[PDB]
Amino acid sequence: MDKFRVQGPTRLQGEVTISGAKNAALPILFAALLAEEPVEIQNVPKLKDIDTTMKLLTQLGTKVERXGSVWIDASNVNNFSAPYDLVKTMRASIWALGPLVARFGQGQVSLPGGDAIGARPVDLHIFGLEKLGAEIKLEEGYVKASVNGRLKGAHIVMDKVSVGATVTIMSAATLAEGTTIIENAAREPEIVDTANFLVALGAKISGQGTDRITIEGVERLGGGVYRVLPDRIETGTFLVAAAISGGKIVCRNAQPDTLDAVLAKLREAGADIETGEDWISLDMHGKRPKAVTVRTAPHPAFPTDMQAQFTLLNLVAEGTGVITETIFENRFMHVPELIRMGAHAEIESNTVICHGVEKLSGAQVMATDLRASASLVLAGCIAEGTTVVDRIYHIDRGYERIEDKLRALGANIERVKGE
Amino acid sequence: MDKFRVQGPTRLQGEVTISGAKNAALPILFAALLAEEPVEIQNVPKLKDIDTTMKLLTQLGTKVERXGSVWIDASNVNNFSAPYDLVKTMRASIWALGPLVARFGQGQVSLPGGDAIGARPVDLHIFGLEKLGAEIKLEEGYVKASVNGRLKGAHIVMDKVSVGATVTIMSAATLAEGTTIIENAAREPEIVDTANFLVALGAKISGQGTDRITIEGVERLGGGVYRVLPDRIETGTFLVAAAISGGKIVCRNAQPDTLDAVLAKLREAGADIETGEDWISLDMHGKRPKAVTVRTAPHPAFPTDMQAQFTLLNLVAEGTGVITETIFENRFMHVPELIRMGAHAEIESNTVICHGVEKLSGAQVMATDLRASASLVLAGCIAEGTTVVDRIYHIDRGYERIEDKLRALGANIERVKGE
Amino acid sequence: MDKFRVQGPTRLQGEVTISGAKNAALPILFAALLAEEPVEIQNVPKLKDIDTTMKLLTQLGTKVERXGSVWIDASNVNNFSAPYDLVKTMRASIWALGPLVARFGQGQVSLPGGDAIGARPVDLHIFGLEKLGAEIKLEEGYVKASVNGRLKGAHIVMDKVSVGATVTIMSAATLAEGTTIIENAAREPEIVDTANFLVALGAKISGQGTDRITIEGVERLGGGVYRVLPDRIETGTFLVAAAISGGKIVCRNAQPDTLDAVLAKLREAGADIETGEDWISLDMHGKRPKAVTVRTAPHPAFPTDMQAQFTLLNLVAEGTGVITETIFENRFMHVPELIRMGAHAEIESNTVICHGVEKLSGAQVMATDLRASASLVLAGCIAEGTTVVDRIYHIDRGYERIEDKLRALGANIERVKGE
Amino acid sequence: MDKFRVQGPTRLQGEVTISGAKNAALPILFAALLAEEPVEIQNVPKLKDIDTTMKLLTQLGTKVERXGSVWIDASNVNNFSAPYDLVKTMRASIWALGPLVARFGQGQVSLPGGDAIGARPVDLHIFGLEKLGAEIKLEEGYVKASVNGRLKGAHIVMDKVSVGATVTIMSAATLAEGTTIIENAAREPEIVDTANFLVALGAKISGQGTDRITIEGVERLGGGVYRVLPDRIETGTFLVAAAISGGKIVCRNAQPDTLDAVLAKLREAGADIETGEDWISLDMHGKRPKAVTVRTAPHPAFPTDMQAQFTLLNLVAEGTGVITETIFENRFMHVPELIRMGAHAEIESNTVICHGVEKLSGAQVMATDLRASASLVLAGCIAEGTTVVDRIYHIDRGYERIEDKLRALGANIERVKGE
Structure with missing residues (x-):
């Protein structure tokens, strides 16, 4: 039963090639x-x-x-x-x-x-x-x-x-x-x-x-x-990895036009974004993210699949931001995991009220949803200490060797087999 | 096409035998x-x-x-x-x-x-x-x-x-x-x-x-x-027919237990209802009806099939009463017709805000909906002057010869061929 | 930070008096x-x-x-x-x-x-x-x-x-x-x-x-x-406590009429029920429950405060059962907990698909919700081994001496103070 | 009571100046x-x-x-x-x-x-x-x-x-x-x-x-x-005006960027559209419109305020097209009016199934909705013969003398007091 062991904190920066x-x-x-x-x-x-x-x-x-x-x-x-x-x-x-x-x-x-x-x-x-x-x-x-x-x-x-x-x-x-x-x-x-x-x-x-x-x-x-075509949600996952870490990252093999809403969203959070024919760049300029307001809706609006990511962004951001699920129900189940890490949040009805904190603290986390799970591996990266993301098989189903990508970015991640 | 010509206003009273x-x-x-x-x-x-x-x-x-x-x-x-x-x-x-x-x-x-x-x-x-x-x-x-x-x-x-x-x-x-x-x-x-x-x-x-x-x-x-079993919607229609005209009606071959919500609502309007094994009595005592608050829902709750009928009741009652649809969208077809008959009302999303008025006025009316249509004919009964409901064929399919029943109640109804 | 330490499996049976x-x-x-x-x-x-x-x-x-x-x-x-x-x-x-x-x-x-x-x-x-x-x-x-x-x-x-x-x-x-x-x-x-x-x-x-x-x-x-009046939910909680353990229980100081929906649901699960003026009896006859279908809704329909409890029921019941929440969203926190206890279920939207297993396993669990928490304690009563429900204060604010009552019922439960 | 008397068919073409x-x-x-x-x-x-x-x-x-x-x-x-x-x-x-x-x-x-x-x-x-x-x-x-x-x-x-x-x-x-x-x-x-x-x-x-x-x-x-800013809905009404008549029109004092969804929508209907910083041009090239599929949704998606207008488009366009009211209820009251003019359509729940007909025919029509009413005046423009729209004060409350603009566009329109 595979696990992810992460050492924090680490600033995510550099390059990542988006999978298909x-x-x-x-x-x-x-x-x-x-x-x-x-x-x-x-x-x-x-x-x-x-x-x-x-x-x-x-x-x-x-x-x-x-x-x-x-x-x-x-x-x-x-x-x-x-x-x-x-x-x-x-x-x-x-x-x-x-x-x-x-x-x-x-x-x-x-x-x-x-x-x-x-x-x-x-x-x-x-x-x-x-x-x-x-x-x-x-x-x-x-x-x-x-x-x-x-x-x-x-x-x-x-x-x-x-x-x-x-x-x-x-x-x-x-x-x-x-x-x-x-x-x-x-x-x-x-x-x-x-x-x-x-x-x-x-x-x-x-x-x-x-x-x-x-x-x-x-x-x-x-x-x-x-x-x-490139993986829109994966691109958004790595884009967010830099945005929450004061990093700077360039996304190769990317497809900007499939990301309009996430990009506008990242900008709102005070991120310096640039895009080319086949790439996307994000520069936090060493800065801390600005809390944003999110409303998931049918494409081309904000993708529900990028929800857990943004919830993490608000969680380690300056100020308060509320994320709303226009579509789905029960998509917050992973939040308590984040709470055990030092996050301040209130699940209210179909929304998640985000109270940004300075630094997350390592801990033992688990989420079955692939997005929520990946969000956890991201938190481990910026949290203080050691974080263990359990049951990462979930992530593997949708992420082409993510620990490797996160490592090239400077993350202190390690795939722990058979516990 | 076959139409109805009613002579208003007349008080609907007496008895009616409910069909299967x-x-x-x-x-x-x-x-x-x-x-x-x-x-x-x-x-x-x-x-x-x-x-x-x-x-x-x-x-x-x-x-x-x-x-x-x-x-x-x-x-x-x-x-x-x-x-x-x-x-x-x-x-x-x-x-x-x-x-x-x-x-x-x-x-x-x-x-x-x-x-x-x-x-x-x-x-x-x-x-x-x-x-x-x-x-x-x-x-x-x-x-x-x-x-x-x-x-x-x-x-x-x-x-x-x-x-x-x-x-x-x-x-x-x-x-x-x-x-x-x-x-x-x-x-x-x-x-x-x-x-x-x-x-x-x-x-x-x-x-x-x-x-x-x-x-x-x-x-x-x-x-x-x-x-x-007896027709519940039919009985309801006749209950309302008297409810909106100070009359007193007794429905025969009725089944009270199938009218819980409708009977309750009628009492709210100020109706004196009584029931037996196979009958239903309704007395207005010459009294005008009182605006009620209706919300349609699945049986045994208020029936949508009784909806149009009650809008008519509100439109000639004392006060303001809102009628809310939760079953059928677009079931407000009758309102515009009742408006053209002297009734005051506002349609807001899935409700109808009714503002009672003393009297209605004859007019050439038409509704494709079985219930709205039969409601129109009722309107003509208490309306001032002559009223003409077109395409009554809709009523014929759900109502067993309604004219003979209305006529038998003091109505000035009249089928019309040619068109 | 009070804790509940339960020793399962223990058949809940006997008598309990319901609080106001x-x-x-x-x-x-x-x-x-x-x-x-x-x-x-x-x-x-x-x-x-x-x-x-x-x-x-x-x-x-x-x-x-x-x-x-x-x-x-x-x-x-x-x-x-x-x-x-x-x-x-x-x-x-x-x-x-x-x-x-x-x-x-x-x-x-x-x-x-x-x-x-x-x-x-x-x-x-x-x-x-x-x-x-x-x-x-x-x-x-x-x-x-x-x-x-x-x-x-x-x-x-x-x-x-x-x-x-x-x-x-x-x-x-x-x-x-x-x-x-x-x-x-x-x-x-x-x-x-x-x-x-x-x-x-x-x-x-x-x-x-x-x-x-x-x-x-x-x-x-x-x-x-x-x-x-007697506490309908408490009663429901005790009723389910037996239902899931093959026990027989007599609820003293109860009021059957406030429980129409919950009683009919227990019958569906195969419980032998009898009521009196101020009492309700539930007998499983040594039998495991049968999966049921539950749609919460505004009183007098199935109570949402009973939700978690019925979920527990289904999770150890015979077959596949469904639990649909029409009242609140984000009320499934108990599921991932129970799943750690050996349970099998998929959360789809406002519903939880239940796959009844024969036995549950003791685990370390926690729920912030009043009902979910009480549900975890019942689970622990019927689970093999030792279960530990953290943050029981939530239960304390809502249940009068839950521990005593469960104890008098056969539960092996202890209040662990300060961890 | 003011009425619009319209003699059609006429081709709407030329220039119009969008009001505030x-x-x-x-x-x-x-x-x-x-x-x-x-x-x-x-x-x-x-x-x-x-x-x-x-x-x-x-x-x-x-x-x-x-x-x-x-x-x-x-x-x-x-x-x-x-x-x-x-x-x-x-x-x-x-x-x-x-x-x-x-x-x-x-x-x-x-x-x-x-x-x-x-x-x-x-x-x-x-x-x-x-x-x-x-x-x-x-x-x-x-x-x-x-x-x-x-x-x-x-x-x-x-x-x-x-x-x-x-x-x-x-x-x-x-x-x-x-x-x-x-x-x-x-x-x-x-x-x-x-x-x-x-x-x-x-x-x-x-x-x-x-x-x-x-x-x-x-x-x-x-x-x-x-x-x-220019009137977005007004501009939409004028574009459709030419779009349904085979004409060409230029919108003066427009703000293209508030019309993204409507412009794309018209392009789908086969309109040849060009834009400037303050102008918008529509050219059907004498061609009949193409049936489109429309889903009204919150800004900046397809504006529910543009719907009645688009329904008209489908009703005289080539082919079948469905229009869905994603948010609002009972948004189709006007349709019957159009059917009375020769339109061929079905109202299914929150949607209208459009069957484009060759030519509409004059008739007496009315609608309380600002936009719906404006839709009927457009229909008059292209319909065969005399069309009489009653209650136009509605149009008067939202449109800056539509009659005047429509006239410069080639319409045979007239403000009258009686039938």
Whole structure:
């Protein structure tokens, strides 16, 4: 059971190369099923989900080999089933459905259930396929989609904005016969990257990143080389690491435009920010951060995923700042951990009232949420003494070797195996 | 088109006989498909929906006829599908699905378009069935249910309280193998009625009316005679009719226990209400009504179906009273009409601030909503001069010949053809 | 820093007598400021708040004493101010305001000023008093209320259900001229109890319990003897204590009607329950509980103060159960604690998915919330080994001798002082 | 009763000069009370509310005059109370409180109010002034704010986001001692515009337009010349005007940066848009508009104030488009009116499903909503034949002689008294 042991305090400064987004990576990987010719997917991160996806693809009859990139060859997909084993460890596995039926005319995914009716996330995917002409079948712990020939483009009005369903409906429509319109499509930067990847293979797609995606079906998708987009939330994690440490840092392999709100936010905190075509720089100028007010909201507004980070920023900032969760519920569960470290805070309703203190004190902390967990490793860096972040496997799922990045930044971090 | 011409103002008084609730009759008629013996359903109102349910049952090979009662003998049922024409003009038709598969092993109902993804009402039905072990098929614009042998009892958790879905599950479970339990069950008097009907056939149901329904499957269901409960909304409409005119009315063939919230509210308005086994008396003593404070909510709370009626009550009462909607958005269609009738009111988000006025004035009015429309006709009754409600066809579908009832109360009503 | 050291597993069983509710004794204790003649308030618990209230009444010039009953003589209330010192620790102190201005024409309570403008609790109190005629001054961290003569009855429409405001408005209405009507009043048993106390004093109150309370002002209130109703939550806590341990328990000095929702829920879990006039019996018959579905909501529905307790129930119950919080957000702190005890659950939004395990393990836990903390103690009672609940003072402020009662029940529990 | 008589179809094209934004003018007019020196507010529209504000100001002792500009000299305010007679028709009048108390230590604004407490819009203002150290006096029908000397800078956290309160708190903080921080401040362009005004008078303000506004109190405010910002909603109405008629239009006196979401939206509809620092041009190139998907949301997202307008666009555009009211309820009352003109649409809960038709047809129409009404006048413009919009005084209260502008644009419009 891996743990992080940190020596504080350490000023975070220097350089960090942002990894590719697991979130753009996943759906792009599934979409690669559409390709007739080989595909090179670059800038893919090394995370559990990528591996599970690799296993899944190979199992469909796909040729898969990885490194910096992942080499996909979907020319010989023979099997059409996503087994129980694979689709229980990873929700994203639902994405195999659409391509399979769009390109092969058939597909089946395992169906973990037991739960509440009218709840299932998959419900949106299934109905999306149904509107496309696919024949759905709910049997044998399964969900089967099939069509004779091509899928039919349709005008689809989304009732609930859904990242997952937008990818499935969009992907499957590239091969559909006719035009498909997705009303209320997810705006996420990841959706845009997936659209672009599709466009690169030969698909005709437009409106990506807006409330309306329009797909013009084509007969087939080729191959080629595509670069997965940088990790927006990771960038924000390192940007915050300098902002709370009086540091100066430059973010390489970054994508500024996917960070508008976090940048404006960092500025409010009195940070000297600069951006280039592919990089972002933050200079605290030895200064202490200025407490900010935060309101999480749907993209392109303040990302909820950057919430715990900002809560830490307010925690070691000059003055008071209140963070509000416009969206979610129960996202503060990690705060008490911070309190045990010398942080002054009041969880009130859907908000967290932040009372900035000069210096945090090392301690024993644990958070299961990846963001909240990473926020803890950050605190250890600026706290006085020794901090132990427990159960970092959580972090590993979403962070490509973070201790290494933090170390190059000057952090006194150490991966402690088997306690 | 057929319109109504009322002569105001007249005091609505005397008696009215309450019709059977179309809403209970509906699922009951469908449930009769489970009956292995002839079934006589008493007290069924003469409405469009009933005719259509009949057309539908006959086309399954069911022996049906009607007068005050609807006779059903599902002895020669050889057809297992509800064709498009039927389902289109009546959403309730999804009700044939559960019984068909529960009793015969198979069943298919038509499925129209439009219903945005994640906003389809039938979604809950497909789900409940699937939980019972049914194989589901979404092909040909059809929703298909089939099972090998009997349906399997299950412990289902309702994500959202659904009247339709609760009826479908409860029904299918009566023929299932083992026990079925519905968490978050809709509590509607209508559901209770359908349960009572099933028990009359020999089903084993309990908890009907509460948030939790328990069904123990049995081998077969018999036959018998069943009286459909009185229409609660109808009774409420007539209670208000007198409430807003100093009159005294006695509703016959009524069911007091289904009117808790409405009866209480009426007392608040200053009404002298009395009740018996099967009747309800309301006396204004020539008195004008008092503005009340209404908040709609799930049964047994204040019914949204009584909403428009009460706005009318406030609009002619003493004082200011706010009416708040928490169920239906856009259910304020009547207000603009009542305004044009001399009423003063302000609409704020999901409420209506009413400012009572002594008298109303005739006018050409129109509302597409069943309840608003019937409310308009009421308005015309106490309004000054001549009032004309267009498109009354909406009222015809939910109200069993309302003119004869209003006329019988001292009203100056009059249907009008041509247009 | 008091600690609870529990030795599990121990089957909770036998008998426990329920204390008076702190939450009824508080508003009633304040209402006593209305009585011109001596008063006896029976069944008042021995808790921090009761002491702070007593001290407050004493400062006002009231002769105050206690044991089981609290003796009060407010015949000579000579001081009209509640200073910072006396109120810093107790929000309920706002209750001194209404009584003071209704009987004496002047009153003032200290306002700790940290609130976020918009959600400030006294807001409703201030508003109702004003609707009653009182002049309100917000000066010197003091909330001031004055009136030349008597308060004037009024029709008050509650914009938000407020147990606080409701009590303040109800209480003062008793001494005002004419009638007062509170639309949207809080329905809490505690409010009914406060009302009963008022009527017992010669007040004219009807509607308590419902959403519409009518008060008929009188001239003076006399004296008399009054019995505070039993603590519904405490009872619920003891009821669940057995339910989770296979035990049988008889709650003495209880009141079954305040527990409709909680009793029906226990039955769902498989408890053999029986009630009397002042008692409730719960028998598990040696059986482990059955997972249940819980949706909190405004009284008379499932109580949010029972939440944590029912979560514990589900976590060691048979199957998967769901707990949904509609009342408060951020009320899941107990979950991560219990999870450290061997429990299995996922927190999704306003809900917690429960996966009942057979046995729990002793661990070091802590919850700042009253209920969560008590829940941890019950967990420890049924967990294998030694559990240590830190910060038990939270429990101390709310439960009368929790340790004794649990002890008499079979628990192996000890108060560890100063760690 | 004024009506708009419109003969269509006609192509709207040419030039229009955007008037001053009523929403920024009102708050500045009030802020002018802080100025010890003659001030000239330019670009003020000729609207009913302005006239009311002027009267209120004169009634205070302020020398007031107007044309395009409103000349103000409040170096000698003598009457510290806004009377019932003046405030009776304008909520905005609550804005006199802040300046009155910050500058002269006392203010009294009359309040009208039937019943019901909590809510009330003024709540926020009264409480904010209190956080600043103002002594508030509350008696039904009025609110008095006083302070002995200067107000004291404070840290205020808004529980609810309020345009009104933000102006009151931001304004009265300019004269206070120390710093006042407003967490959760409204971000509207008008808040930014009001703030800029204060800065032009010597105020120290930063953050306007973001979630956190910070004010550094100064000794006094001066005078000068200031220009109210263009009317964003007005500009939107004019763009759509050409956008739905196939015409081309240039908006003079515009401020492009307050229209990001609407500009992008029009671009989606296929409009060819260009902009300058103070102009905006729209060219359909004789082309019919493209159906778009619209999600209204808080600034700077798609403005709910632009919705009715956009719905019109969809109703005569090519294809299907859905408009969702993400925040506000019952925002579609006007739709029926448009359907009466030949529109094809469905109102589903919080959304409108648009089916673009070729040509609308004249008809008698009415809407109370400012924007909705303005939508109908536009529809007349493009519809076939004669359209009669009743109750246009609504349009009169927010638009600076729309009839005139529409005429120069090529419309056949006429202000008439009867059908």
